[PDB]
Design a protein around this ligand. Structure first.
Ligand code: HEM
Ligand code: HEM
Ligand SMILES: N[C@@H](CCCNO)C(=O)O
Lengths: 201, 206
């Protein structure tokens, strides 16, 4: 990722916030020169992405995790709200379309996790916390977790470098910014909320 | 990507439909074992993803394209609607959470595209086609395009392999499936609509 200076994070908490808010991530490694990716829930341990630790799991039947045994670098991509910006919204001549989006790319050394039950149970706790009411695993569900464990592989990524993009129209002037924000308010309220939180800095 | 048989596409038309519907893709290369990714609009040339050609562009200022000569194996990830499935929705004991989603992973060789103007103009046409009204570039806009072109690097991907995941709760029983779809209908109608279209020709036991 090439972070355009105008679209850089305003505060390091912004990157960590996007990661925590969007745990369904893309985990990428290189296998014989070919990138291979798995969609998986990934949670953050620590206050910052850079220097933090990511924890995730995937299927044992998914051969991707075999590339982690040698502890290569892996890239984990967290994607926030996003949306196409049509020149119809800009309502100007000379116009060029855009795509507004936010994302955090974390790269670091992967390590297979022996504590696979701990990872999945911490993932439940993290993903249920924003819900009201939250689901708490019962003894019967935790027994089911143990029964499922042979089929899961858990992993940790120690983040060496983080790049975060917040391309949220902050370069526009007040007039068009309002047009873009109002257009997203309708059917992309997540993007509109992220625009509001992005100017909160 | 490992495509679990239970979540496989019923027809290759499903993969191409997802790609066309979700053009803001992730373009990934690997350089000396380190993956690098760029978010970019990518369009499909042809009726099928496998064997088809993808066209996209990124910033010339983005050093990612410099790797295309020495590392031409590239993955393009197209992501459709998705959403967390809480066991609260199931309303059953023994339960395990899930994340429902659909995605297409296209892998192949990348090459620089010589006609960058054609790529960006076809990208406009594709992204405006589902809109009403659709925006057609004015002469002044097309002049601006030509003025901006030096700052673009356009690329082509000849797709060797396509893998598609449609993890849309098809393994649940009908009762639980209905609960999941109804829960998504409110604030994730795109995901609910995708569940509906995916279950049309979904084949168990195939
Ligand atoms: C907390 C929320 C959870 C989410 C969002 C989630 C999501 C997922 C996803 C997306 C996959 C596919 C990964 C891949 O493509 O390789 C997967 C696989 C798997 N996960 Fe989880 N999971 C969660 C919790 C758990 C728990 C608590 C367990 C208990 C052991 C578990 C065990 C498994 C197993 C056994 C598989 C392999 C499935 C198969 O081979 O068919 N997961 N999970
Ligand atoms: C059709 C909808 C379009 C979308 C969604 C779109 C999106 C994008 C994105 C996301 C980037 C950043 C890529 C990166 O990170 O490297 C980019 C770069 C760029 N695109 Fe497009 N684009 C569109 C159309 C066009 C058109 C018609 C032109 C006319 C030449 C154009 C010219 C450029 C330029 C000059 C850059 C580099 C900007 C810079 O250096 O800051 N784009 N575009
Ligand atoms: N789908 C598997 C395990 C999924 C757990 N992660 O979603 C099952 O239901 O046995």
């Amino acid at each position: 990722m090439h972070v355009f200076p105008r679209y850089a994070a305003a505060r390091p908490e912004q990157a960590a916030e996007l990661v925590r808010s969007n745990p369904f991530a893309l985990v990428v490694s290189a296998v014989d020169g070919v990138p291979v990716a798995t969609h998986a829930p990934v949670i953050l341990e620590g206050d910052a992405v850079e220097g933090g630790t990511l924890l995730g799991h995937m299927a044992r039947a998914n051969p991707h995790w075999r590339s982690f045994a040698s502890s290569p670098d892996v890239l984990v991509v967290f994607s926030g709200p996003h949306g196409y910006v049509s020149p119809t919204v800009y309502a100007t001549d000379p116009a060029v379309p855009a795509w507004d989006y936010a994302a955090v790319h974390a790269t670091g050394r992967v390590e297979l996790a022996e504590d696979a039950l701990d990872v999945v149970e911490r993932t439940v706790a993290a993903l249920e916390a924003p819900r009201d009411p939250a689901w708490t695993p019962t003894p019967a569900s935790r027994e089911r977790f143990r029964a499922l464990l042979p089929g899961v592989v858990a992993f940790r990524v120690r983040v060496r470098t983080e790049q975060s993009m917040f391309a949220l129209s902050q370069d526009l002037d007040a007039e068009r910014y309002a047009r873009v924000r109002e257009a997203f308010a309708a059917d992309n309220p997540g993007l509109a909320d992220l625009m509001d939180r992005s100017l909160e800095h």
